Amino acid sequence: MNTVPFTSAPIEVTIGIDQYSFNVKENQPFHGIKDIPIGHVHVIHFQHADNSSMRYGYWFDCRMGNFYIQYDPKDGLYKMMEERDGAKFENIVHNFKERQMMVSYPKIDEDDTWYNLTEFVQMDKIRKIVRKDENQFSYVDSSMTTVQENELSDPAHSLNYTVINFKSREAIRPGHEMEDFLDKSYYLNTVMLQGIFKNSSNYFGELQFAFLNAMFFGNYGSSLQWHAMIELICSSATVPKHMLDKLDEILYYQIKTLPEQYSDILLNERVWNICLYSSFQKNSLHNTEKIMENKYPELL
Amino acid sequence: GAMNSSNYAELFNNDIKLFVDDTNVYRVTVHKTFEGNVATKAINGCIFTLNPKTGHLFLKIIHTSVWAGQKRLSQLAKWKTAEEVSALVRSLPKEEQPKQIIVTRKAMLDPLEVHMLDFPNIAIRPTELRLPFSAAMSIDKLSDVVMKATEPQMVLFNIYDDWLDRISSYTAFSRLTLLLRALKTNEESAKMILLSDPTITIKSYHLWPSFTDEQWITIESQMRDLILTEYGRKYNV
Helix H or strand E segment including A20? strand A20-24
Q: How far apart are the first and last CA of chain B?
A: 35
Binary contact (B114, A169; C-beta < 8 A): no
Minimal CA–CA distance to A166: which of A107, A234, A111? Answer: A234
Q: How far apart are CA B76 and CA B54, in angstroms?
A: 30
Q: Which of B114, B94, B124 is nearest to B17 (CA)?
A: B124
Q: How was this structure determined?
A: X-ray
- CB contacts < 8 A, A to B, total 21
Distance of CA B102 to the CA centre of its chain: 12
Instruction: Quote the CA–CA distance of A246 and A227 in Å, as a whole number.
Output: 16
Nearest-angstrom CA–CA distance, A17 and A6: 13
Closest CA to B21 of B46, B2, B4: B46
DSSP assignment of A123-191:
HHHHHHHS--TT-SSEEEETTPPBHHHHH---GGG-B-PPP--TTSTTT--TT-HHHHHH-THHIIIII
- In contact, B115 and B86? CB cutoff 8 Å: yes
Query: How far apart, in whole angstroms, are the C-alpha atoms of residue A233 and residue A238?
Result: 9
Give me the domains of chain B, ranges plus CATH numbers: 9-163 (3.30.420.230), 164-237 (1.20.80.40)
| Helices B213-235 + B187-195 axis angle, to 10 | 160
CA distances from A169 to A176, A179, A180, A228, B90 (A): 11, 14, 11, 17, 17
Chain A: nearest CA to B103, how far in angstroms?
18
The residues pairing with A13 across neighbouring beta strands, listed in sequence order, are A24, A48
- CB atoms under 10 Å from CB of A229, counted, come to 24
Interface with B, mutate which of A177, A183, A187 (most B CBs under 10 A): A177
Which residues from B are below 8 Å from A172, CB to CB? 114, 117
CA-to-CA separations, B86 to A200, B20, B43, in angstroms, rounded = 36, 11, 23
**β-strand partners of B154:** B60
Whole-number Å distance between alpha carbons of A288 and A267 = 13
- Tell me how far apart the alpha carbons of residues A271 and A282 are, in angstroms, rounded to a whole number: 12
Note whether A178 contacts B111, CB cutoff 8 Å.
Answer: yes
Residues of B in contact with A151 (CB under 8 A): none
What distances in angstroms separate CA B73 from CA A132, B30, B67, B112, B163, one per listed residue? 52, 14, 7, 17, 38
In this complex, do B117 and A181 lie within 8 Å of one another by their Cβ atoms?
A: no
Beta carbons within 8 Å of A33's beta carbon, 6+ residues apart: A3, A4, A15, A17, A44, A102, A103, A104, A105
Interface check for B230 against chain A (CB to CB < 8 A): the answer is no
| Pairing of the two strands A32-36 and A103-104 | parallel
Q: Distance between alpha carbon B69 and the CA centroid of its chain, in Å? A: 27
HEC profile of chain B:
CCECCCCCHHHHCCCCEEEEECCCCCEEEEEECCCCCEEEEEECEEEEEECCCCCEEEEEEECHHHHCCCCCHHHHHHHHHHHHHHHHHHHCCHHHCCCEEEECCHHHHHHHHHHCCCCCCCEEECECCCCCHHHHHHCHHHHHHHHHCCCCEEEEEECCCCHHHCCCHHHHHHHHHHHHHHHHHCHHHHHHHHHCCCCCCCCCCCCCCCCCHHHHHHHHHHHHHHHHHHHHHHHCC
Residue pair B180/B138 in contact (Cβ under 8 Å)? The answer is yes
| Strand, coil or helix: A96 | helix
Three-state DSSP state, A5: strand
**Interchain CB distance below 8 Å, A168 and B79:** no
- For residues A39-75, one letter each, b for 16 or more C-beta atoms within 10 angstroms of the residue's C-beta and e for the rest, the string is ebbbbbbbbbeeeeeebbbbbbbbeeebbbbebeeee
For residues A258 and A226, the answer to whether their CB atoms sit within 8 Å is: no
Report the alpha-carbon distance of residue B59 to residue A288 in Å, rounded.
49
DSSP sequence for A190-234: IIIIIIIISSHHHHHHHHHHHHHHHHHH--HHHHHHHHHHHHHHH
Whole-Å CA distances, A14 to A17, A212, A247, B28: 10, 18, 32, 66
Contact between chains at A167 and B114 (C-beta distance less than 8 A): yes
> Which residues in chain A have Cβ-Cβ distances shorter than 8 Å to B110?
167, 181
B135 with B180: CB under 8 angstroms?
yes
- What whole-number distance in Å separates Cα of residue B226 and Cα of residue B188? 11
Query: Residue B10 and residue B88: Cα distance in Å, rounded?
Result: 23
* CA pair distance B120, B140, nearest whole angstrom: 37
Contact residues of A toward B, CB < 8 A: 167-169, 172, 177-178, 181
Taking CA–CA distances from B120, the nearest residue in chain A reads A168
Checking phi first, is residue A35 left (phi over 0); if not, alpha (psi -120 to 50) or beta?
left
Could you tell me if B117 lies within 8 Å of chain A, comparing CB atoms?
yes
How far apart are the CA of A175 and the nearest CA of chain B, in angstroms? Answer: 9
- Give the mutation candidate from B114, B116, B122, B124 for the A interface (greatest A CB count, under 10 A): B114
**Does B114 sit within 8 Å of A181, measured CB to CB?**
yes
Documented resolution in Å: 1.9
Domains of chain A: 1-143 (2.60.34.20), 144-300 (1.25.40.550)
Q: Given an 8 Å threshold on Cβ–Cβ distance, is B82 in contact with A177?
A: yes
What HEC string does B57-95 produce?
A: EEEEEECHHHHCCCCCHHHHHHHHHHHHHHHHHHHCCHH
Task: Name the 3-class secondary structure at A268.
Answer: coil
How close is the nearest chain A Cα to the Cα of B116, in Å?
10
